[PDB]
Ligand binder design. Structure first.
Ligand code: BR
Ligand code: BR
Ligand code: BR
Ligand code: BR
Ligand code: BR
Ligand code: BR
Ligand code: BR
Ligand code: BR
Ligand code: BR
Ligand code: BR
Ligand code: BR
Length: 95
């Protein structure tokens, strides 16, 4: 899997070249990490990066006891249905 760095200065996880990332926002006193946008340019498609970036962020929230809101569409309509085992990290009021 490609190295995904945590770039806090920007609240995103990103590939090391900065070119693909998922952005978020922390809600409720740090406890909720909301995923707002996953971005992979067309020339980086086909490398599985969006999903790799969503794993980084889900792992990071699981490791830190955060609940995720799956606000980006890539996440809620592609990531979560394909990776159900991550569903329990979703905050319980989303769905
Ligand atoms: Br990369
Ligand atoms: Br890279
Ligand atoms: Br934030
Ligand atoms: Br917060
Ligand atoms: Br609370
Ligand atoms: Br925070
Ligand atoms: Br891909
Ligand atoms: Br992708
Ligand atoms: Br995926
Ligand atoms: Br799964
Ligand atoms: Br399911």
């Amino acid at each position: 899997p490609p190295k995904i760095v945590w770039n806090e200065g920007k609240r995103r996880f990103e590939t090391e070249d900065h070119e693909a990332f998922i952005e978020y926002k922390m809600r409720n006193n740090g406890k909720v990490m909301d995923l707002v946008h996953t971005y992979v340019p067309s020339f980086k498609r086909g490398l599985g990066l969006a999903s790799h970036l969503c794993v980084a962020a889900f792992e990071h929230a699981s490791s830190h006891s955060i609940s995720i809101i799956p606000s980006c569409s890539y996440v809620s309509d592609t990531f979560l249905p394909r990776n159900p085992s991550w569903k329990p990290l979703i905050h319980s009021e989303v769905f």
